[PDB]
Every structure is written in C-alpha cells, then in structure tokens.
Amino acid sequence: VLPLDPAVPAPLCPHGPTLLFVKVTQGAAATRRFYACSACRDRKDCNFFQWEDEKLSGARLAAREAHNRRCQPPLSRTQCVERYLKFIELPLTQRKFCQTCQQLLLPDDWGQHSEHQVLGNVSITQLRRPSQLLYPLENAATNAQYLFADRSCQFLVDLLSALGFRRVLCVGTPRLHELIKLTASGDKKSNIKSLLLDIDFRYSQFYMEDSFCHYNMFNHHFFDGKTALEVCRAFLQEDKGEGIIMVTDPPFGGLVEPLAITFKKLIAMWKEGQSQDDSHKELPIFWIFPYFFESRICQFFPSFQMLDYQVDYDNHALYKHGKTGRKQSPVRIFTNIPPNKIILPTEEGYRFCSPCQRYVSLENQHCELCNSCTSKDGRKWNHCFLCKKCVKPSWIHCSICNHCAVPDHSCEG
Numbered sequence: 030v031l032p033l034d035p036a037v038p039a040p041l042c043p044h045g046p047t048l049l050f051v052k053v054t055q056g057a058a059a060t061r062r063f064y065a066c067s068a069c070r071d072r073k074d075c076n077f078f079q080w081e082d083e084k085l086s087g088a089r090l091a092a093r094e095a096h097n098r099r100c101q102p103p104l105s106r107t108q109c110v111e112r113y114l115k116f117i118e119l120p121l122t123q124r125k126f127c128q129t130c131q132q133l134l135l136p137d138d139w140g141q142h143s144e145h146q147v148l149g150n151v152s153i154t155q156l157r158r159p160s161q162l163l164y165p166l167e168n169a170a171t172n173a174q175y176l177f178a179d180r181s182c183q184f185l186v187d188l189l190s191a192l193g194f195r196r197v198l199c200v201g202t203p204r205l206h207e208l209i210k211l212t213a214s215g216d217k218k219s220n221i222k223s224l225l226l227d228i229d230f231r232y233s234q235f236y237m238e239d240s241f242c243h244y245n246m247f248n249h250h251f252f253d254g255k256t257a258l259e260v261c262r263a264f265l266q267e268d269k270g271e272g273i274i275m276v277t278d279p280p281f282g283g284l285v286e287p288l289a290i291t292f293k294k295l296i297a298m299w300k301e302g303q304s305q306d307d308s309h310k311e312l313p314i315f316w317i318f319p320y321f322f323e324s325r326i327c328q329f330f331p332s333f334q335m336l337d338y339q340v341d342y343d344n345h346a347l348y349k350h351g352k353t354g355r356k357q358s359p360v361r362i363f364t365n366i367p368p369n370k371i372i373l374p375t376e377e378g379y380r381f382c383s384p385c386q387r388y389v390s391l392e393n394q395h396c397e398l399c400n401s402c403t404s405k406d407g408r409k410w411n412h413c414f415l416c417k418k419c420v421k422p423s424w425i426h427c428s429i430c431n432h433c434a435v436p437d438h439s440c441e442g
C-alpha cells in the first residue's frame with residue numbers, strides 16, 4: 030500500500046527536487062520512504078538521503094541549503110552569455126580554451142590557467158561545435174555522455190528536415206543540437222531552430238539564453254528559474270504549436286518512469302492553450318534508446334513504434350567496434366510518427382519492406398508470423414509459435430516454464 034500523495038514537495042538537492050523511493054523486500058511486509066537524488070544513481074556524487082518522517086531542523090537545513098547553493102556551476106548563466114559575447118569578438122589569436130577546466134578563456138584570466146593545458150586559436154567553427162571541443166562525460170552513473178557518430182547525426186538532421194519541422198526541442202542531445210544549427214545557418218535557407226535542454230552546464234558558455242537551458246531531465250527542473258522555463262514554454266507554444274518535434278537521448282541506464290513523467294510534463298506545456306476541439310494531436314517525439322527497452326517505453330507511451338535505424342555512436346558503453354571490425358549498435362528510435370513516413374538511407378544498407386510498410390535493415394529477415402522484420406540483433410532470429418513471437422536464436426522453448434529464454438536461466442512454473 031502506497032497512499033502516496035503527490036501534494037507535498039520533495040526536499041531540494043543540488044540538482045533540484047529529490048525523488049521519492051520506497052523499498053519493498055524481505056517478504057514484502059515492510060516499507061521505507063526516502064527522498065534520494067533525481068539524477069544520480071549511486072550516492073557517490075549526490076549523497077542525499079532523508080527519511081520522509083525525518084524533518085530537517087533550522088540549522089541542519091541551513092547547512093543543506095548552503096551546500097546546495099555551493100554545488101552549483103561556478104559561472105552564472107548570465108555570466109556565460111556575457112563571456113560568450115565578449116569571446117566571439119576577440120581575434121582568433123586571443124580565443125583560448127582551457128581543457129583541464131573545460132572553460133572558454135577571456136584574455137584577462139589567462140594567467141590563472143597558465144600551468145593548465147590550454148588550447149589556442151579557438152575558431153568560430155569550433156565554437157559552433159562544442160560537442161567536439163569539450164571532452165565527453167562518459168560516466169554511466171551521472172551523465173553517460175555518449176555522442177552520436179557524425180554519419181548518424183547528419184542522418185537525423187536530414188530526416189527532421191524532410192519531415193518538415195522548423196523547431197527541434199533537444200532534451201539531452203548536444204551534438205544533434207549543434208548540427209541542426211549548422212544545417213540551418215550554412216548554405217541553406219532552411220530554417221531550423223534548436224533549443225538544447227541538458228544538465229551539462231558546460232554547454233552554457235556556447236549557446237545564448239534562446240538556445241540552451243540548464244535542465245534536469247528526471248524531475249523537470251530549470252536550474253535558472255522561471256525565465257528559462259518560459260524560454261522553453263515559448264519554444265513549444267510557437268506557431269500555434271505546429272512545426273515542433275522533441276528528440277531525446279537520455280542516459281541509457283537510468284530510471285525510466287520519471288523520464289516518462291518529465292516528458293509528459295513537457296507535452297502538457299505544449300498542449301496548453303491548444304483548441305479544445307482539436308485535442309487529437311500529440312507532440313511528435315523521438316525517444317532514442319537501446320532496443321531492449323521497448324516493452325517499458327511503449328508501456329508509458331502506447332503510441333510509440335520502434336524504427337529499424339541503427340543509431341551509431343562515436344562512444345558507447347553498450348558496444349565498441351572490435352578488431353574484427355564494427356559491432357552493431359543496439360540503440361534505436363522510438364516515435365509516434367508513422368514509420369511509413371520515415372525513409373531510411375538506402376546507401377547505408379536499408380530497404381523498404383512492403384509487408385511491414387516501413388524501412389528495415391539489409392540483414393533483417395521478415396518474420397511472416399508476427400508480420401514484421403523481427404531480427405533486432407545482428408543475427409537471424411527464430412519464431413516460437415507457442416509464445417507467438419520471435420526470440421533471439423540462442424533462446425530455447427523451455428518445458429514447464431512454457432516461455433522462451435536462454436539456457437542457464439531460472440525456471441518457473
């Protein structure tokens with residue numbers, strides 16, 4: 030029994046309102062309510078823990094509040110915008126970037142970074158590609174910053190163009206953001222705006238207030254307040270809500286329920302003020318995620334189907350290309366956009382499967398008994414008829430269990 034009440038507000042951690050966890054174990058007869066950190070899995074980075082009954086005293090809470098104020102990024106958002114306007118107006122031979130600090134450098138505070146490792150002659154080309162200048166925060170427990178491979182990212186910007194979107198709400202996709210901006214600015218009158226939402230405050234010194242928001246994705250928190258929140262609200266509400274799509278690449282291993290709750294808050298911002306009669310539209314969404322999360326994702330967004338495009342990364346914890354060659358990427362796209370409207374590059378090994386009106390991989394065989402090109406892995410799958418589905422070729426149909434699974438599994442029933 031959780032008579033859990035959303036009415037009352039969580040305590041505040043450095044990364045915005047904590048989330049409530051409850052443990053049920055040891056016979057499922059005891060409960061424990063506590064507020065943990067919304068966007069840090071292990072306690073090693075955000076060591077927040079408070080029993081719900083536990084109430085902070087005046088002094089102890091003052092300490093908590095000051096600590097939260099202290100853990101904030103060392104530059105205000107406003108300071109970032111001002112430093113940027115001053116930076117892009119220096120000669121090339123005076124644009125420096127400190128790599129040990131991940132900070133753009135104004136000529137006056139070079140001395141403080143003298144004995145650091147500093148990169149010189151930062152061109153505007155680099156400034157408009159921050160994903161290639163800052164090192165990626167690859168820790169799986171906090172950021173999981175795995176950046177798209179150039180080929181796949183260019184595919185995504187081209188797909189968003191051909192579909193006919195002018196605004197792209199980029200929650201957790203820095204590289205896609207920057208490439209959208211470069212395809213809108215250079216050599217094309219195609220207008221595409223992009224609004225990066227991310228917890229990586231390092232991207233604040235590269236985009237002005239209209240293009241970036243310091244944003245926590247697990248609790249729907251704008252670190253800079255209502256001004257930033259309203260930047261986001263206007264970016265959704267523009268053009269009566271038309272011409273907008275939200276692309277997300279959340280950290281692959283993180284809780285997946287609060288993600289859906291945050292995404293639904295965003296959709297709620299987009300649906301406000303829209304015609305009551307015309308309430309049959311949903312906000313077009315790309316949820317980029319490894320394929321084995323489908324069951325969970327479609328449990329929260331019934332209107333989502335999985336495209337067969339293999340999204341490739343420069344770096345990832347799920348696959349790194351071996352000496353034999355390149356291993357395949359488990360990460361796919363999940364959309365409410367009809368997959369028959371989405372055309373995959375035929376020059377990458379992608380063909381249109383007429384039975385399941387959508388594009389599929391070149392090595393993907395079409396299973397005629399669940400009516401879809403079913404081989405998600407790099408191999409050829411098999412169709413079990415008692416489970417009425419296709420399982421990976423290493424799985425077997427177990428007796429007594431009566432459902433498909435690997436040898437060396439736990440038997441049930």
Ligand SMILES: Nc1ncnc2c1ncn2[C@@H]1O[C@H](CSCC[C@H](N)C(=O)O)[C@@H](O)[C@H]1O
Pocket residue numbers: 068171172173174175176177200201202203204205206226227228229244245246247278279280
């Ligand atoms: N709690 C959180 N709130 C907002 N953004 C977060 C977050 N946790 C991780 N992120 C961001 O989400 C991104 C996931 S890595 C995916 C990046 C994207 N595929 C690209 O290549 O451009 C990281 O950049 C990280 O900064």
Ligand SMILES: [Zn+2]
Pocket residue numbers: 127128129130131141142145146
């Ligand atoms: Zn430095």
Ligand SMILES: [Zn+2]
Pocket residue numbers: 382383384385389394395396400401402403
């Ligand atoms: Zn097929």
Ligand SMILES: [Zn+2]
Pocket residue numbers: 396397398399400403411412413417418419
């Ligand atoms: Zn099948």
Ligand SMILES: [Zn+2]
Pocket residue numbers: 413414415416417425426427431432433
């Ligand atoms: Zn079976």
Ligand SMILES: [Zn+2]
Pocket residue numbers: 427428430438439440441
């Ligand atoms: Zn079994």
